[PDB]
Amino acid sequence: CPRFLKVKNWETEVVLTDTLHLKSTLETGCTEYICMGSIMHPDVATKDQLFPLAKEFIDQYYSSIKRFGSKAHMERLEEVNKEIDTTSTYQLKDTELIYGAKHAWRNASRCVGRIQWSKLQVFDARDCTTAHGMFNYICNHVKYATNKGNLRSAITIFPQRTDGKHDFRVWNSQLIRYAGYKQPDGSTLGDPANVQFTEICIQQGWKPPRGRFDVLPLLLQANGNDPELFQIPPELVLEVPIRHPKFEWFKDLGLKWYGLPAVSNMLLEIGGLEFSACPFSGWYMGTEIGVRDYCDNSRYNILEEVAKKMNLDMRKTSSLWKDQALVEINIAVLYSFQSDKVTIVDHHSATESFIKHMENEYRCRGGCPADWVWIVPPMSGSITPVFHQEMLNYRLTPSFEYQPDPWNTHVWK
Amino acid sequence: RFLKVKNWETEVVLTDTLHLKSTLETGCTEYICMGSIMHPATKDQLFPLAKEFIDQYYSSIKRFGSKAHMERLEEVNKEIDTTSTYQLKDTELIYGAKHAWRNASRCVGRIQWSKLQVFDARDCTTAHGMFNYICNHVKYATNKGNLRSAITIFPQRTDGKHDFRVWNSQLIRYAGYKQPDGSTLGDPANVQFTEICIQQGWKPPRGRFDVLPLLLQANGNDPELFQIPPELVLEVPIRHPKFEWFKDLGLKWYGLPAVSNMLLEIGGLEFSACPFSGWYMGTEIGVRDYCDNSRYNILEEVAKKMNLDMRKTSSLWKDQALVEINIAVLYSFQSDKVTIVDHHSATESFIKHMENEYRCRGGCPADWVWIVPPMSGSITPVFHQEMLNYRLTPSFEYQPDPWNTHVW
Numbered sequence: 172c173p174r175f176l177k178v179k180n181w182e183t184e185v186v187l188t189d190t191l192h193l194k195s196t197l198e199t200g201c202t203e204y205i206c207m208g209s210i211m212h213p214d215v216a217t218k219d220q221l222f223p224l225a226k227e228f229i230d231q232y233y234s235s236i237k238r239f240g241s242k243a244h245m246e247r248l249e250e251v252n253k254e255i256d257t258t259s260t261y262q263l264k265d266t267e268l269i270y271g272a273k274h275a276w277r278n279a280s281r282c283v284g285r286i287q288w289s290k291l292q293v294f295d296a297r298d299c300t301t302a303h304g305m306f307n308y309i310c311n312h313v314k315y316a317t318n319k320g321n322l323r324s325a326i327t328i329f330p331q332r333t334d335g336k337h338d339f340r341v342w343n344s345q346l347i348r349y350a351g352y353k354q355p356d357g358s359t360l361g362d363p364a365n366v367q368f369t370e371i372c373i374q375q376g377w378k379p380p381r382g383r384f385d386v387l388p389l390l391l392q393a394n395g396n397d398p399e400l401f402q403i404p405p406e407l408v409l410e411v412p413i414r415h416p417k418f419e420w421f422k423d424l425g426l427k428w429y430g431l432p433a434v435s436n437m438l439l440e441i442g443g444l445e446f447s448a449c450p451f452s453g454w455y456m457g458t459e460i461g462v463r464d465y466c467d468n469s470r471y472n473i474l475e476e477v478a479k480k481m482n483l484d485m486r487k488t489s490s491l492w493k494d495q496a497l498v499e500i501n502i503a504v505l506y507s508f509q510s511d512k513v514t515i516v517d518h519h520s521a522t523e524s525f526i527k528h529m530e531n532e533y534r535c536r537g538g539c540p541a542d543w544v545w546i547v548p549p550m551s552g553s554i555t556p557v558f559h560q561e562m563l564n565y566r567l568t569p570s571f572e573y574q575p576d577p578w579n580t581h582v583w584k
Numbered sequence: 585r586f587l588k589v590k591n592w593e594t595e596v597v598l599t600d601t602l603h604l605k606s607t608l609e610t611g612c613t614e615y616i617c618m619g620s621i622m623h624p625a626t627k628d629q630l631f632p633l634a635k636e637f638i639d640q641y642y643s644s645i646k647r648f649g650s651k652a653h654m655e656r657l658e659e660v661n662k663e664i665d666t667t668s669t670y671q672l673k674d675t676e677l678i679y680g681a682k683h684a685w686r687n688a689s690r691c692v693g694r695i696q697w698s699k700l701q702v703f704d705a706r707d708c709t710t711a712h713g714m715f716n717y718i719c720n721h722v723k724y725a726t727n728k729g730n731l732r733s734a735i736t737i738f739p740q741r742t743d744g745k746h747d748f749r750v751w752n753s754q755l756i757r758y759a760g761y762k763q764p765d766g767s768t769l770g771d772p773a774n775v776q777f778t779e780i781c782i783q784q785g786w787k788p789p790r791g792r793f794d795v796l797p798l799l800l801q802a803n804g805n806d807p808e809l810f811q812i813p814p815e816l817v818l819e820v821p822i823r824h825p826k827f828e829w830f831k832d833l834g835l836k837w838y839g840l841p842a843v844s845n846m847l848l849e850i851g852g853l854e855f856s857a858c859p860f861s862g863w864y865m866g867t868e869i870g871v872r873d874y875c876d877n878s879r880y881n882i883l884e885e886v887a888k889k890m891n892l893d894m895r896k897t898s899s900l901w902k903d904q905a906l907v908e909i910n911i912a913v914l915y916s917f918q919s920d921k922v923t924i925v926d927h928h929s930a931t932e933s934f935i936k937h938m939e940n941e942y943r944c945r946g947g948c949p950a951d952w953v954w955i956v957p958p959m960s961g962s963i964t965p966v967f968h969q970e971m972l973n974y975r976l977t978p979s980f981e982y983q984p985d986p987w988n989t990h991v992w
């Protein structure tokens with residue numbers, strides 16, 4: 172591979188040089204003859220696989236704190252190697268755990284909010300042993316991160332995988348999501364994205380309210396045991412009713428959303444160690460709710476209803492009634508969050524901040540992996556600066572990874 | 585291996601086998617994706633490429649290995665020997681041009697690929713000749729507003745010293761003027777090309793929408809200026825169906841999008857001048873041409889007239905103004921009976937096209953970064969459609985601007 176790769180911004184003519192790609196550790200899915208950049212997703216580590224992965228990470232950590240090649244660096248390598256030899260695994264120091272988590276975020280090529288990467292509150296939950304304990308840790312996370320609307324990015328990290336038959340898993344895809352209910356007539360009540368998980372909850376004993384916005388219970392698996400159900404205290408669940416600054420009728424749609432996006436189904440990989448339960452949270456970009464959650468056909472799908480209330484001409488697509496309604500919904504979402512003083516960022520501000528972040532990273536780090544397909548917002552793409560920005564996508568470690576849904580792999584006891 | 589692409593909204597899964605046919609590179613590697621990078625002969629190289637192309641041509645007319653196929657390979661080989669190149673049959677030229685379009689991974693309009701009027705201009709020898717062929721193209725493709733896809737193909741490259749080039753990036757474009765006060769009048773994208781025309785003798789009206797002259801290079805000679813007869817140049821005054829002040833913006837655009845700076849590659853042969861044209865998708869004008877910061881950049885003026893609150897980005901004043909502008913463009917073209925497609929209809933057609941190609945061809949190379957429209961991305965079906973991108977030949981390729989390689 173060439174030592175220097177250039178990316179250009181076609182709007183500003185700014186040209187940046189990437190050297191960080193040389194540190195790429197994993198496959199992208201692409202080859203020299205095919206690109207899989209729009210593909211959504213294109214038994215443990217052995218002692219011998221683990222050694223060089225741990226060293227890679229430890230070296231990186233000591234290089235970051237400007238103690239590379241120091242006595243403490245050499246001692247740490249030695250202690251880690253000993254631990255791998257005698258136990259087939261090792262334990263991260265608190266400092267290394269914090270470094271790894273922050274860097275997994277820094278390295279997340281699909282994330283547009285990475286300007287914030289170094290301000291991440293890391294909660295060490297590696298002493299956790301039961302689902303009740305996981306529930307305690309999760310509640311504390313939600314309350315801290317919510318902060319009465321002044322949201323603070325946080326991650327809570329549960330014990331790493333051992334043999335793979337003792338995984339900690341949060342079965343929820345996010346800590347706070349709304350139930351979806353398939354009706355016998357084929358219609359869906361609530362959020363169609365969550366139908367399968369909802370059915371699992373109901374089977375595990377959850378009594379569903381059967382509303383449009385029912386917060387789902389936590390389904391928590393500790394140490395490989397069968398998962399258990401917990402209700403999040405509703406006072407911990409901050410919600411924002413959606414209204415529009417102009418259209419008084421908008422509130423009559425009865426929409427609302429939760430303040431805290433808290434993804435809970437990803438795997439955090441640090442130095443060859445795998446943390447299969449590591450829920451993390453930031454705050455929303457408005458389009459995630461206003462475009463995707465509300466306007467996706469397979470989601471709440473409200474464009475038509477909004478369009479009808481707006482008295483739009485809905486017979487020709489070329490009236491752009493869909494686009495017109497989509498903007499007003501996104502205006503309402505931002506307006507409702509800002510009014511209730513709940514942190515939210517519009518797509519214009521987020522993408523402008525991301526460009527600045529990316530430029531800083533190119534300067535201080537030699538690059539910034541970025542997945543254009545994901546970074547460009549789902550509405551008004553070219554009127555944001557990221558649309559015009561060439562990006563290079565590659566996989567650095569530590570990293571957040573996808574993992575199979577736990578109900579597909581779980582051995583029921 | 586067979587590769588599956590999924591639509592995450594419809595759950596439809598397609599299976600790609602066609603990618604196994606590609607031999608050209610994408611720019612990506614196993615470790616680095618360059619999907620968002622804009623741009624990532626000899627007799628000895630020539631014959632396998634020719635053979636490859638003749639083979640797929642005869643395979644496409646269901647006569648692979650026929651007497652005709654065999655004589656053709658023989659003839660081509662003989663010709664590459666004695667002449668260092670070869671000439672395509674008419675049937676082959678047309679097949680090659682339609683397939684270059686069919687294989688254009690960045691084009692959302694490909695459902696139309698087999699409907700392409702091919703104009704053979706390979707007998708052309710002078711810039712006046714090129715001008716004649718180009719006028720005929722424009723008149724044919726414009727068709728009084730009922731636009732028809734067309735391509736005009738000028739002689740292929742020989743030694744690199746005698747290239748035919750259309751210096752314009754499109755046959756019809758607006759001039760851009762660098763003003764004393766440092767602002768730009770007209771289209772900033774064309775400031776440089778405009779300066780070259782001016783230096784070559786063009787007398788500029790110095791307006792906001794001055795149609796550029798053609799600058800035509802034949803057989804490696806210095807380019808020559810030509811004015812396209814104005815009655816051939818179809819234009820649309822942009823107005824809004826609700827905002828009666830919109831017409832007062834003084835906006836217009838031309839109805840015919842006719843890209844003239846690409847290189848058509850067929851069977852090893854390179855056609856450095858192959859202007860082609862279809863019709864507009866509305867966002868090309870309403871989002872990119874009008875609203876890019878580096879183009880006409882009108883959002884602020886429009887938002888003003890809509891009396892929007894422009895102090896905070898989170899009022900989405902930009903998005904509101906953007907939608908209204910695109911409504912105006914579609915409305916204006918439709919009212920003037922000039923062919924245009926909105927991005928909803930275009931992307932729907934593209935999904936149907938993909939479905940067709942997978943069924944009959946085993947796949948469809950597609951560049952998501954380019955296929956998804958520059959506004960309202962996820963409310964169009966292609967946003968949710970996984971796509972595989974790979975390079976098939978015949979193809980359209982980028983080439984250097986002639987003013988960076990030309991000796992006068």
Ligand code: HEM
Nearest residue numbers: 276279281282283284287324325451452453454455456571
């Ligand atoms: C603090 C404010 C944050 C903002 C505004 C933000 C924004 C976003 C957005 C808009 C996406 C695309 C989401 C989608 O369309 O589904 C995303 C993806 C992602 N974010 Fe961030 N994020 C933030 C914080 C975080 C934090 C704290 C982490 C981890 C520590 C993180 C890690 C990720 C990862 C791994 C993805 C890829 C998700 C996937 O592939 O499904 N983000 N982010």
Ligand code: HEM
Nearest residue numbers: 685688690691692693696733735860861862863864865980
């Ligand atoms: C008939 C109606 C057509 C429509 C609606 C259409 C639509 C589009 C659009 C919207 C783009 C993206 C261009 C941009 O954003 O700058 C594109 C790209 C492209 N089109 Fe089509 N197109 C049409 C016809 C054609 C024809 C007739 C040809 C060739 C014979 C063609 C070949 C291409 C190629 C090669 C690209 C990629 C250009 C590049 O890489 O810069 N298209 N098309």
Ligand SMILES: Nc1ccc2ccc(CNCCCc3cccnc3)cc2n1
Nearest residue numbers: 211284432434452453454455456459592
């Ligand atoms: N505001 C934020 C911050 C961080 C986020 C991290 C992740 C996500 C959502 N990822 C959604 C994946 C959706 C999906 C669907 C089907 C298959 N794979 C993935 C949002 C964030 N938002």
Ligand SMILES: Nc1ccc2ccc(CNCCCc3cccnc3)cc2n1
Nearest residue numbers: 181622693841843861862863864865868
């Ligand atoms: N409606 C149509 C039909 C066919 C088209 C073919 C091409 C294009 C535009 N190509 C734009 C490339 C712009 C660019 C700028 C800088 C570097 N590389 C490329 C539009 C079409 N529209």
Ligand SMILES: C[C@H](O)[C@H](O)[C@H]1CNc2nc(N)[nH]c(=O)c2N1
Nearest residue numbers: 209210211544545967968969970
């Ligand atoms: C097919 C395509 O890869 C898929 O729809 C992607 C496109 N880009 C995205 N970008 C973001 N931020 N989030 C998404 O869910 C997606 N979905």
Ligand SMILES: C[C@H](O)[C@H](O)[C@H]1CNc2nc(N)[nH]c(=O)c2N1
Nearest residue numbers: 558559560561620621622953954
């Ligand atoms: C950097 C990025 O590749 C560039 O801005 C691309 C993005 N997608 C595009 N898509 C289309 N249709 N046309 C374009 O000019 C671009 N520009």
Ligand SMILES: [Zn+2]
Nearest residue numbers: 201206612617
């Ligand atoms: Zn790629």
